[PDB]
Symmetry: C3
Subunit: 333 residues, 3 copies
């Protein structure tokens, strides 16, 4: 009886950060209340100043990571302000029924809706917008995110022993398809409706123009590099709502990886690289063992270093010369 | 001694349906006899009336699902009628030796052949045509299907307990590469031989023009939507003989998934989406928990909703408001 | 204390062959010493005589397979002769820290360096060149290979029982992006620096012009076909530093497969085809059961048979008619 369950209100935070939560459930099942406001906005996605009409949950690409426990109820108030011009909705891959909630959450500008669903399966899951007839346009305009449904007793390794993270980050990876003129320059439109049919032609080529983390080239670098310390246990949740990706921590590993993101399965150990299929969220657990800069990439290195799918960690601590050392620094023969 | 084994003749059925079989073997090992007639035919693959010279086993794209048990013998009579104009053969991924049988089954028009092989490994497997020098043209002209080799004691979960399906469907997913003129319109040819070299150029671009289930855009929708009831256990076998796919049941999950299709492995649980590599068949088991329409897709949503890789389930039964409910239907603020 | 450990010097061999090693470690942990000389060279990659400025470790594409045991120390002397014109370095995916060693191994022509790292994780791993700002160009010019870190007690099956191979081969699969003129003919440059910017445009299309095993179309065929005998246990290590692949032994299987290459995980059994993500090495174990020619392919059959990703095994021994036989050879009706 759902009336009788506790309610807790969660205030979301902007990726790659994750809202505060408990790994091990400190309460019984709850109705966990979220609100997201849909924002249609111009976003600059690259160093060149290329613009897209982005379609966002809560103003970000990706949408924020929501976190609950298995057999919690997720209750989302989804608001489509009258400053928007499109139809929106939401499909949670975590949910069961009505196209993941998409059939129940179609909101015109000036409308809102509240959906509740029971999070029966533990894992990380994609959520995305999916209005009938215009689904790939919405998703590849950035209107996707993820939800983590933790087991009530937290994550476990392949032996069933607890794995506890110190830090969690959420990397949303976005393929964009910016339409081009016949010379191959990107096009600009006053409104999203004007972009749409050219958007469909660009998507049908299947090759992205850009592939970015956290909504832009370089978003997770510099002052916005991810951070950790030697000895810290870090979970990286990574989603890709539309295309395969192959994440790799350059300088590290995934010590435990749920490549297709579902925590009732034992993790894969010691991964160099893993395949997160388009329409999936995955999670990798790593304990840093060396300080310094790491590149976290889609290991199609073209996608990473030419199209945008690369971020950095800056890791503090002491250097372990037993794990790695320069015996002879680069020098002339 | 094979003479002494029972023979059973199977009459195949058109995908997405599957011929009658027993999950748990009710006999000892058998020689299971199949006949397929090769048909070269014009097929309309999209709503626009785009045509291809399709190359089929038994008149369908995909070819029918064959079902046997482990350590049965598959005996296929493969007929190339004199109304055809090409060389054909068959490679079973389930089989061992002679390029999966391809080296033994090359039939000119007006020829037939009978191949026998022992199905030593349980799983779902691709079969396809593969004539030396022209293999991708044949496969991507639709000449592929799948065979399921069930364990003799039926499917098992990750704990080794029986999993019994009520219903099984076979989704064959086909990438087509229809040649284009310089404006990007699809080309038509009187005969397959006239299409061939332009076919090779179109394939070499690597990007499909169409990606369809059951041989056409919309084939598994409307009167040909897949069906189930709440509480029904359904196995969806999915193959892709040439390219990766990432199936997703929109509104559901794969409760147990053999993404790369081999039943001696424990299934992956609770999948949102899974990666079936090109040249593979996979299988997902799901118990429906909600009525209504589901979209079963390749979750590159461009491939699904622009190129054709989307089908529907229509599911009957009562709606469970505990699993999902609209708290506040879409309404003005 | 590393001074006190044994040192062993390994002399590498050209792929697809693998240097001599012990599967089960016959010594305690060692510093295993390797030397590689970087060679920039013109390579003809196809039957048409298409040329690329290849960037190699030790003169080969791929670079040689290095083999050590877990908790050995790998010590690589990497030499950039003054006959080269580019900056090079090396990222070992097996290693921990400093971008896999890339941050410590940047050598100008006329320089060398020696890196040591502890091989803490067992598996097969990609290594590649990765100079900051030019990483995908180097990798897709062929400057990648793999390292196998065997468990000290050798490989184990899914039950933890020994798996011992008779033969090991290393297939490096290389996506190349040869720039084209406007008619689609490949371009030639006097020097690598002249190719670079056109190389970047070609890579950004994301679709390879060629995809080859062992550095060229047809490299593992004819006199250079891989070989085995019926009853022989063969491990095929396969890497792809930049794009997904889907290996398949046509006529066979992967009896035990580590698709993402990490030996602390149980292998997947009875695979027809497996997904090795770009930036990964994988390994498949197979016991041949039939003689004859096998095609070992990337099972995007376009990539295999049009772009180059196909090799052969020639297998000797007797034919098993119980596993497969022609009942009726192709003949007229
Ligand atoms: Cu939307
Ligand atoms: Cu989805
Ligand atoms: Cu055929
Ligand atoms: Cu095949
Ligand atoms: Cu280099
Ligand atoms: Cu790498």
């Amino acid at each position: 009886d759902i009336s009788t369950l506790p309610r807790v209100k969660v205030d979301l935070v902007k990726p790659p950060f994750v809202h505060a939560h408990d790994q091990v459930a400190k309460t019984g099942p709850r109705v966990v209340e979220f609100t997201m406001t849909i924002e249609e906005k111009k976003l600059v996605i690259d160093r060149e100043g290329t613009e897209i009409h982005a379609m966002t949950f809560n103003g970000s690409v990706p949408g924020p990571l929501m976190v609950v426990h298995e057999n919690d109820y997720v209750e989302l108030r989804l608001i489509n302000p009258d400053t928007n011009t499109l139809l929106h909705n939401i499909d949670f891959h975590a949910a069961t029924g009505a196209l993941g909630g998409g059939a129940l959450t179609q909101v015109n500008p000036g409308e809102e809706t509240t959906l509740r669903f029971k999070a029966t399966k533990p894992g990380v899951f994609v959520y995305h917008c999916a209005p009938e007839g215009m689904v790939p346009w919405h998703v590849t305009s950035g209107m996707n995110g993820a939800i983590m449904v933790l087991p009530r007793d937290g994550l476990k390794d392949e032996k069933g022993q607890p794995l506890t993270y110190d830090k969690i980050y959420y990397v949303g990876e976005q393929d964009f398809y910016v339409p081009k003129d016949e010379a191959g320059n990107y096009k600009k439109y006053e409104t999203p409706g004007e972009a749409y049919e050219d958007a469909v032609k660009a998507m049908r080529t299947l090759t992205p123009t850009h592939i970015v983390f956290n909504g832009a080239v370089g978003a997770l670098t510099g002052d916005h590099a991810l951070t950790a310390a030697v000895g810290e246990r870090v979970l990286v949740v990574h989603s890709q709502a539309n295309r395969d990706t192959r994440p790799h921590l350059i300088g590290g590993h995934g010590d435990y990886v749920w490549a297709t993101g579902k925590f009732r399965n034992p993790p894969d150990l010691d991964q160099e690289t893993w395949l997160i299929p388009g329409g999936t969220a995955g999670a990798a657990f790593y304990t840093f063992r060396q300080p310094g800069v790491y590149a976290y990439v889609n290991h199609n290195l073209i996608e990473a270093f030419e199209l945008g799918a690369a971020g950095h960690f800056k890791v503090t601590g002491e250097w372990n010369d037993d794990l790695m050392t320069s015996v002879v620094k680069p020098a002339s023969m």
